[PDB]
């Protein structure tokens, strides 16, 4: 029998638990605290999400088996752990209330260690550290036999989560040559947004600009692939940018124009990735209609925009933090993270 | 018999005459001074160039008939007045030493009043002011019967030339709506350069930038259609831009990269007009080779560049002067001038 976990209740549970963790003083309240610290501070991202998700599920509905990863697992209390983790923890909680400190993963239950019916030592794992963390996370979840124990361990896990750092790139290096390669690289999917965001930082860093990127497929988005970048000055957005690596559609335009017009933002740029070039819209019509709503709309290919901003741009004691924060805020994929890591060592 | 006027001597003559005019105190030295003032201060651009050219020719080589406009005219002393005016006066003199005060025309001898073998009252002309100036310019040139008289009247003509103003557009108007239409208009030929120059002024005016455009087809240009824009800050060029409404070629690239690398300029943008989209070059190859010469090269369509700069840009007590100076410096065509004049009244 599967258990249908109430995600509204789960959200309130984890918010309470985070609040308890933020004021927690005694974290050694049970013998699993050592294992909890080692998993949460450890290097295996998927086991961190599996641990938080299973503890949250049991603290919300004690009928779940917290070792179940899928609702079709052959155990009583199987439940849709992917849905709980992606909808509640990733979708609503980690960004706003944990500063991306669990890892800022967008879809952690698509990683190989989560693609099993059960979280068990029968699942393959690399010798050494990973094998240790697999068994530790199993042991903690096996100990979460009651709702109150699950909640107690959830608060401990979030207490240590708050101690993690959310930096993925890390000496006065040759930031000139690396930044230019990222600017001018043939982008794909979300790497288009990262390059565009970096370009804007270069151009505006010295002009007081603050660039903020947002993860794709938010609630109420016009399409699933569009990615929002806001450019602030004096803490007011003056430019709203949308990045898409699929052709923009009329709903994308309508949503962005209406959203800017409401906010009093008068400039919107739509940036087209290499796979967004074949138009489904009449860009001229969109611009004309946008003007009637008092919004100045324009379109550019991403790589043209990035190289133009770079040409127009002027120290680099802030580029690393900016990239780290941007990768965190968009819940960047591993491919994107590996690309940025690789080009900083090359 | 045609007369072959020595343009090197003609250049030295007019430079001397300008210097005399700059220090001239008595301009009433002969009875033609009234007519000279009325032609030079008058509104008929082609008669101003015809007058200056004929006086210069006679002051250089008194064998010319200063009423001849073409070397095949049926008079002794016919000579190539178009060549003298375009090569020497327009090509070398008016910009640097007269501040464009004759009219900053690029090809004045292609205007209809100059397309005759002789400058004569038989040529058709509009009733009223134009008819008066035609006859006045004829009368002065008919009086230029000796080299010394031609030179005396040339100095008077340049004395009054220096009193002219070189402004072609002219209340706190709606500079917002007009500038945006010029930014976003479907450009053609040199109107692409004007829009691009305006975009850069908007983006950099408040950042200390000075934008300088140059006329097409300079001596030693890589091609006949390319148009140079330099962007200064602190009186150092930091960005060199080329605008072309025909496909760029490898000589264009080589010239711009070599010229920037020599000057120590590290950024070059090539802007493609709507008729420059079909490539004759591999842009990626050009960029890679430019990087090896320490120059960062990029390409953009003009209209993408202009709308992007506008989106990134922040008072308008300086836009009129900037446009007037830019139109002057490129020796803008009448079509370009009429377009800018029209959209400022519409």
Q: Domain of B182: which CATH number? A: 3.40.1340
Distance from the Cα of B191 to chain A's closest Cα (Å) equals: 20
Q: Which helix (H) or strand (E) holds B287?
A: helix B283-292
Query: Is residue B221 exposed (0-12), middle (13-18) or buried (19+ Cβ within 10 Å)?
Result: middle
* B267 close to A (CB below 8 A): yes
B304 to chain A: nearest residue by CA?
A300
Tokens 């015809």, residue? B50
Pair type for strands B267-272 and A210-213: unpaired
Contact call for residues A7 and A142 (beta carbons, < 8 A): no
In angstroms, rounded to a whole number, what is the distance separating the alpha carbons of residues B150 and B32?
11
In angstroms, rounded to a whole number, what is the distance separating the alpha carbons of residues B211 and A127?
63
| Token pair in block for residue A18 | 């985070």
Report which of B215, B160, B164, B166 is spatially closest to residue B18, judged by C-alpha positions: B160
CA torsion angle for A26, A30, A32, A35 (degrees, to 10)? 20
Last residue of a domain, one of B107, B130, B161: B161
In angstroms, rounded to a whole number, what is the distance separating the alpha carbons of residues A128 and A241?
45
Binding residues of B: 122, 172, 228, 242-243
In angstroms, rounded to a whole number, what is the distance separating the alpha carbons of residues B82 and B104?
15
- Residue A127: how many CB atoms within 10 A of its CB? 7
| Token pair in block for residue B4 | 């072959």
In angstroms, rounded to a whole number, what is the distance separating the alpha carbons of residues A81 and B153?
96
Report which of B340, B266, B273, B258 is spatially closest to residue B297, judged by C-alpha positions: B266
Q: For residue A136, tell me if it sits in a domain.
A: yes
Q: Are residues A129 and A245 in the same domain?
A: no
Helix, strand or coil, per DSSP, at residue B297:
strand
Helix, strand or coil, per DSSP, at residue A248:
coil
Q: For residue A2, tell me if it sits in a domain.
A: no
Q: Are residues B157 and B179 in the same domain?
A: no
In angstroms, rounded to a whole number, what is the distance separating the alpha carbons of residues A237 and A264?
9
Q: Are residues A142 and A226 in the same domain?
A: no
What is chain B's alpha carbon radius of gyration, rounded to the nearest angstrom? 22
What is chain A's alpha carbon radius of gyration, rounded to the nearest angstrom? 22
In angstroms, rounded to a whole number, what is the distance separating the alpha carbons of residues A246 and A278?
9
In angstroms, rounded to a whole number, what is the distance separating the alpha carbons of residues B215 and B229?
9
In angstroms, rounded to a whole number, what is the distance separating the alpha carbons of residues A216 and A194?
13
CA torsion angle for B84, B86, B92, B96 (degrees, to 10)? 130
Contact residues for B109 (Cβ-Cβ < 8 A; gap 6+):
B46, B49, B53, B69, B81, B82, B85, B86, B115
In angstroms, rounded to a whole number, what is the distance separating the alpha carbons of residues B67 and A200?
61
Find the CB nearest A308 among B184, B268, B269. B269
Contact residues for B120 (Cβ-Cβ < 8 A; gap 6+):
B67, B138
Contact call for residues A240 and A298 (beta carbons, < 8 A): no
Contact call for residues B209 and B217 (beta carbons, < 8 A): no
- Residue B269: how many CB atoms within 10 A of its CB? 24
Q: Are residues A55 and A143 in the same domain?
A: yes
A267 to chain B: nearest residue by CA?
B311
In angstroms, rounded to a whole number, what is the distance separating the alpha carbons of residues B27 and B152?
9
Q: For residue B190, tell me if it sits in a domain.
A: yes
DSSP letter string, A21-34: HHT-----SSTTHH
Resolution in A: 1.9
Q: Are residues A104 and A14 in the same domain?
A: yes
To test the contact with chain A by mutation, choose from B298, B299, B305 the residue with the greatest count of A C-beta atoms within 10 A, namely B298
Contact call for residues A242 and A228 (beta carbons, < 8 A): yes
What does DSSP assign to residue B118? Answer: B
Q: Are residues A197 and A313 in the same domain?
A: yes
Is A172 assigned to a binding site? Answer: yes
Q: For residue B253, tell me if it sits in a domain.
A: yes
Report which of A254, A140, A232, A245 is spatially closest to residue A195, judged by C-alpha positions: A245
In angstroms, rounded to a whole number, what is the distance separating the alpha carbons of residues A230 and A117?
40
Pair type for strands A236-244 and A267-272: parallel
Q: How far apart are the first and last CA of chain A?
A: 52
Report which of A35, A50, A55 is spatially closest to residue A144, judged by C-alpha positions: A55
Please report, for residues A191, A322, B70, B128, B228, the alpha-carbon distance to residue A338 in angstroms, rounded to integers and kept in the order given: 11, 17, 72, 78, 41
Contact call for residues A145 and A30 (beta carbons, < 8 A): no
> Which structural technique was applied?
X-ray
DSSP letter string, A218-252: -TT-SSSS-EEEEEEETTEEEEEEEEESS---HHH
Burial of B284-309, coded b for 16+ CB within 10 Å and e otherwise, reads eebbebbeeeebbbbbbbbbbbbbbb
Q: For residue A168, tell me if it sits in a domain.
A: no
Last residue of a domain, one of A111, A139, A161: A161
Pair type for strands A267-272 and B210-213: unpaired
* A89 close to B (CB below 8 A): no
In angstroms, rounded to a whole number, what is the distance separating the alpha carbons of residues A346 and A334?
18
Q: Are residues B186 and B299 in the same domain?
A: yes
Q: Are residues A188 and A135 in the same domain?
A: no
Q: For residue A170, tell me if it sits in a domain.
A: no
Contact residues for A98 (Cβ-Cβ < 8 A; gap 6+):
A18, A158, A161, A162
Residue B308 to residue A300, Cβ atoms within 8 A: yes
Q: Are residues A141 and A82 in the same domain?
A: yes
| Token pair in block for residue A47 | 């086991």
Contact residues for A330 (Cβ-Cβ < 8 A; gap 6+):
A190, A193, A194, A213, A214, A215, A216, A227
Residue A308 to residue B287, Cβ atoms within 8 A: no
Beta bridge partners of A271: A243, A300
Q: Are residues A185 and A98 in the same domain?
A: no
Helices and strands of chain B, counted as H and E runs: 14, 5
What does DSSP assign to residue A86? Answer: I
In angstroms, rounded to a whole number, what is the distance separating the alpha carbons of residues A243 and A223?
11
In angstroms, rounded to a whole number, what is the distance separating the alpha carbons of residues A315 and A299?
30
Question: How many domains is chain B partitioned into structurally?
Answer: 2
Q: Are residues A247 and A142 in the same domain?
A: no
Q: For residue A166, tell me if it sits in a domain.
A: no
Q: Are residues A224 and A287 in the same domain?
A: yes
Distance of CA B260 to the CA centre of its chain: 24
Tokens 């209209």, residue? B303
Contact residues for A3 (Cβ-Cβ < 8 A; gap 6+):
A61, A63, A64, A77, A78, A79
* B312 close to A (CB below 8 A): yes
Last residue of a domain, one of A136, A161, A186: A161
Residue A305 to residue B301, Cβ atoms within 8 A: no
Q: For residue A47, tell me if it sits in a domain.
A: yes
Domain limits for position A179: 175-345
What does DSSP assign to residue B299? Answer: E
């Amino acid at each position: 029998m599967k258990v249908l976990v109430n995600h509204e209740q789960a959200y309130n549970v984890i918010i309470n638990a985070i609040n308890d963790a933020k004021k927690l003083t005694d974290y050694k309240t049970n013998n699993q605290w050592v294992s909890i610290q080692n998993v949460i501070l450890g290097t295996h991202l998927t086991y961190r999400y599996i641990l938080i998700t299973g503890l949250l599920a049991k603290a919300t509905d004690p009928r779940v088996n917290p070792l179940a990863l899928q609702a079709n697992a052959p155990v009583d209390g199987a439940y849709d752990a992917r849905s709980l983790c992606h909808s509640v923890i990733v979708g609503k909680v980690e960004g706003p209330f944990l500063e991306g400190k669990l890892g800022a993963s967008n879809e952690p239950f698509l990683n190989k260690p989560a693609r099993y019916m059960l979280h068990s030592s029968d699942n393959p794992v690399r010798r050494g550290n990973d094998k240790v963390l697999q068994q530790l996370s199993i042991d903690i979840l096996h100990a979460a036999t009651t709702q109150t124990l699950a909640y107690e361990m959830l608060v401990i896990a979030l207490y240590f989560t708050l101690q993690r750092t959310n930096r993925v790139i890390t000496i006065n290096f040759d930031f000139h040559k690396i930044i230019y390669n990222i600017i001018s690289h043939p982008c794909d999917g979300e790497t288009c947004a990262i390059a565009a965001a970096i370009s804007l930082h270069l151009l505006g860093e010295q002009r007081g600009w603050i660039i903020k990127a947002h993860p794709v497929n938010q609630a109420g988005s016009s399409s699933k692939e569009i990615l929002d970048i806001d450019v602030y000055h004096d803490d007011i957005v003056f430019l709203s940018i949308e990045v898409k690596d699929k052709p923009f559609n009329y709903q994308d335009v309508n949503h962005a124009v209406s959203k800017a017009s409401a906010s009093g933002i008068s400039k919107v740029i739509f940036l087209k990735g290499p796979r967004a070039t074949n138009l489904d819209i009449d860009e001229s019509l969109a611009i004309e209609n946008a003007a009637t709503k008092g919004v100045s709309l324009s379109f550019s290919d991403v790589m043209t925009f990035t190289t133009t901003c770079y040409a127009l741009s002027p120290s680099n004691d802030r580029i690393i933090d900016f990239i780290n924060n941007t990768l965190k805020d968009i819940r960047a994929k591993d491919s994107t993270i590996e690309y940025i890591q690789s080009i900083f060592k090359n």
